Amino acid sequence: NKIFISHATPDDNDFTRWLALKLIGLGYEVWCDILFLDKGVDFWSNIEKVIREDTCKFLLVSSSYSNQREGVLKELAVAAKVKKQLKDDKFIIPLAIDEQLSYDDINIDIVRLNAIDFKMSWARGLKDILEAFEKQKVPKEVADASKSNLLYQQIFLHDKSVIEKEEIYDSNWLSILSFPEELRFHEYNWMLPKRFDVRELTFPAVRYKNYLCTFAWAYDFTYHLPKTETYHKSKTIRIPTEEILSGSYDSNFIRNAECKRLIVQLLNKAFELRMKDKEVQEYEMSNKTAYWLEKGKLEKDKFEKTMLVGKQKDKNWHFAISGASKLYPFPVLMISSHIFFTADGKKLIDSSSVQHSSRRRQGKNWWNNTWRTKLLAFIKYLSDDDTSFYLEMEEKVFVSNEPVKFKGNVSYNI
Amino acid sequence: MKELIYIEEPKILFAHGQKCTDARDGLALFGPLNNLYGIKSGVIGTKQGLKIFRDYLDHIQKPIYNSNSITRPMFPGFEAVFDCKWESTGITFKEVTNEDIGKFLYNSSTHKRTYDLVSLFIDKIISANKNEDENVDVWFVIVPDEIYKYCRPNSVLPKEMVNYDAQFHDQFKARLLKHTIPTQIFRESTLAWRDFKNAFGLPIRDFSKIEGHLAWTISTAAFYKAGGKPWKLSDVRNGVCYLGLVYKKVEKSKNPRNACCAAQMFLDNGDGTVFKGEVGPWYNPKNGQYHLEPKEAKALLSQSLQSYKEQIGEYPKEVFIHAKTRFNHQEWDAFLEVTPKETNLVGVTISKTKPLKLYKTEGDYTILRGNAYVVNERSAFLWTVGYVPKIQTALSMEVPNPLFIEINKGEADIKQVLKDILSLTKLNYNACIFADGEPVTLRFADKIGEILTASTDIKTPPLAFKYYI
Amino acid sequence: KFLYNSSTHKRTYDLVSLFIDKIISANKNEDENVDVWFVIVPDEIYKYCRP
RNA sequence: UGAGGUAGUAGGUUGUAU
DNA sequence: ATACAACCTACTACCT
Ligand SMILES: [Mg+2]
């Protein structure tokens, strides 16, 4: 009732799996060794027993690998013995699948038999197999693809699936813990265009309708602008930051979204100034800016044994990060990783085409662990204390150096 | 420290009602739903191009292997998979002379050069379609690599060798929409990558380890273009219609416009997945604005609802509008003025701009595909790219990017939206791969828009995707 | 709905258009590939569609 | 343009309020 | 018309 398939176990599996599944889905009962995930030690006895007592046809995958394989030859000898015993002239059917193995090199037990040509087309070979099987009255049941689907799921799809295991992922978000109690709008009036540059001030501040909005005191700007030296504390509007972050502010004087945008602007400016304070090299991208270390800054560019500066062939590659504060869903700092290429130890390659090509050439061989370790080391270098680092706001804002972790209930097994 | 939720991998449907996750494996074991009898191919190009195409067609039939058959499944041959004939004997040749190509190739203006080459190919296409008695299912345009190199919008022709979009592919497919001819454009280096080498004596494109993947992609695209259905979704609900809206800039006119194209997917009463376009790109005269007018929004929704009713018999119960932009109040009010009471309108925004990256702590691989991070009742992250255990490799390159899926307008379950998107990611007929990142609605609306905004003289374009992809 | 118009010209035009629109729509807006379109025409249409 | 992915280079719009 | 934030598209370049 069964149909035995014999092949080279680790070499001709691509064709054998296809043929076995195709024949099983067509109603035929197929015995192939790769259909069992649990081969016993005494499997040869079972193979001989199934050849002697079960199989009605013996299909042999003829290839260069299987031409002189010892186990295949032993199976061929047993099949020949059963063929002589059973008085079946067409018990052994060779399926020629290899173009390299010429028809003049087949082994002695096969050189006399009529083979099925799978070299030019597998569909034609399967059509010939089915035509011979119906012509020779090989037993078969009704066609059912469910059997093929189930066997494919069980055998070739058992070690490749998800499992219910807990996993912890490290992100690039920097949750902000501490904020200044109040945000102040100082009514500086004109103040000589209120230092129209604004961006060159010592503290992050913005210009509202007729106020200077910042988290710092009024007298902190006396150095750049002396008009505040006489300005009194009466002309200011103090608002609570925590109330705004909770979506509580209202009224037509100011909108909650505008307040959040102003806070984002202040945080971005403060991050830029603090990152400048660290005395690192700055790269101006198309729509953002990144901060990278030079070749001679560290001893020796191996902070936390992770490496930060290296050489590809003749240039120097440097890891860099770009930060941007955000208030959705919670106040965090988006951190994005980048790589920059310098011809010398501390220089820059002016052309962007070479930089982009080298970046894409380098990124092909880094992967998750390298990216995570380099990002974590670069972000821990900037830490101003054990588990935080500060941005100037008197007041200041502290940001954790440990990115928020994520929990997952499923994962894989490598 | 936040938690994640896993979304099960969707199963696509194949012949004999057999479900599977991998399109390639399902095609290999069971086969396509349709029964094509054979593909009759028309080849256009120089004699070298015809020889290249014939050699590749002969090579396709024999089994093709990859470096790893676990990560990338092998190709057992065209007929063994699709059970239909695509042979080199059914080839119809329309020769294009190399001298004719060179007459138009070296020109000062890239617009004139691309127009002349595109017209040179299309004239032969239409002449063979009208004045020849043989039937051709798909026309295969073999293009020399010089034509590809020197017909790009920003390509420059070296000084020593010296409307409509200045792009060969988009202008080629846009000027063939009046005659409804499915076309497959190939480059000579794609099918003969061995014969084109660089200065170091090695091929520019290395397909040695991915030969079977190339065969899979090409064969699946050719089978779809000839009118066959390789697979379909299996778990999609009844009464819900998916819409995908994409805006594109039109530089053909003096005044810039934002043409909005759509893609529509749903289920018919015969359990077949109806996936097609929604065209007549509704323009906007304001530059930099990607929001539809009330009249154009009404027209779009009315056309979509009328098509659904004609194909089914009644208005859809639910409508989902996937868009890369955020709908505003006026456009949504215009949309709601067309829908009946029984139809629920949901407007979802799908973006890939939010920079959130999750690094696995103790491995060289990436986060599992299907993981989600529900931000709140209207916003979530979906990881459509990542490590797939079935192929033991990641779809991404270095670290996958997440999709920030937000239910901008209407009331719906966010988990259901994520499941619908992750099921849509399995319907890409332009490629034979595991599920890609973006949903098929947005991707195919983008593909439609890139062609409909090439040539202006498109009154009523066809809805089938074989004329665009 | 069109076969019983008094004028032969308008009847034939409307009814030909009814038969033609479906063919064109299935040519452009459907993913099947059709070699020959076999238009089966009843006897009532045929008899009353001559000059 | 076999197809996806990852980046980079440019431009634009919108709410405020100088 | 300047400064900013929050969204938008177009056009390449490299890997497998
Ligand atoms: Mg295509």
Sheet with the most strands, sense and barrel status of chain A: 5 strands, parallel
Bound molecules: magnesium ion
Radius of gyration of chain A, in angstroms, nearest whole number: 37 Å
| Overall form of chain B | globular
List the quaternary state of the chains: part of a larger assembly
Distance between the termini of chain B: 44 Å
Number of strands of chain A: 19
What proportion of the residues of chain A is helical, as a percent range?
A: 25-40%
Distance between the termini of chain A: 40 Å
Number of helices, counting only DSSP H or I runs of 4 residues or more of chain B: 13
Secondary-structure-based class of chain B equals alpha/beta
Q: Which percent bin holds the helix content of chain B?
A: 25-40%
Instruction: Please describe the biggest sheet of chain B, giving its number of strands, its sense, and whether it closes into a barrel.
Output: 9 strands, mixed
Order of helices and strands of chain A: EHEHEHEEHHEEEHEEEHHEEEEEHHEEE
The total of beta strands of chain B comes to 20
Largest interface: A-B, 54 and 54 residues
Quote the beta fraction of chain B: 15-25%
Sheet-strand content of chain A, in percent, reads 15-25%
Structural class of chain A: alpha+beta
Binding site for NAD(+) 2 (chain A): 33, 103, 114
Domain TIR (chain A): 1-146
Keywords (chain A): Nucleotide-binding, Receptor
Protein name (chain A): TIR domain-containing protein
Please tell me about this protein's structure.
Chain B: Keywords: Metal-binding. Chain B: GO terms for molecular function: nucleic acid binding. Chain B: Mg(2+) 2 binds at residues 430, 469. The structure is cut from a larger assembly and holds one copy of chain A (414 residues) and two copies of chain B. The longest helix of chain A has 22 residues, at 256-277. In chain A, a hairpin with a 4-residue loop joins strand 12 (281-284) and strand 13 (289-292). Chain A contains ten helices and 19 strands. In chain A, the strands form five sheets. In chain A, strands 2-1-3-4-5 form a five-stranded parallel beta sheet, sandwiched between helices. In chain A, strands 12, 13, 14, 15 and 16 form a five-stranded antiparallel beta sheet that branches. In chain A, strands 9-10-8-11 form a four-stranded antiparallel beta sheet. Chain A has helices at 13-25, 43-53, 70-86, 122-135, 145-155, 191-195, 241-245, 256-277, 352-362, 367-381, and strands at 2-6, 29-32, 55-62, 92-96, 116-117, 167-170, 176-178, 182-186, 205-207, 212-214, 236-240, 281-284, 289-292, 309-311, 316-326, 332-342, 389-392, 396-399, 405-408. The radius of gyration of chain A is 37 Å and the shape is elongated. Chain A has 414 residues and is α+β, with helices and mostly antiparallel strands. By secondary structure, chain B is α/β, with parallel strands linked by helices. In chain B, 30% of the residues lie in helices and 21% in strands. Chain B has 13 helices and 20 strands. In chain B, a hairpin with a 5-residue loop joins strand 3 (12-13) and strand 4. The longest helix of chain B has 22 residues, at 110-131. Bound molecules: magnesium ion. Residues 221, 430, 469 of chain B line the site of magnesium ion. Magnesium ion is lined by residues 221, 430, 469 of chain B. Chain B binds a DNA/RNA duplex (18 and 16 nucleotides) through helix 7, strand 8, helix 9 and strand 10.
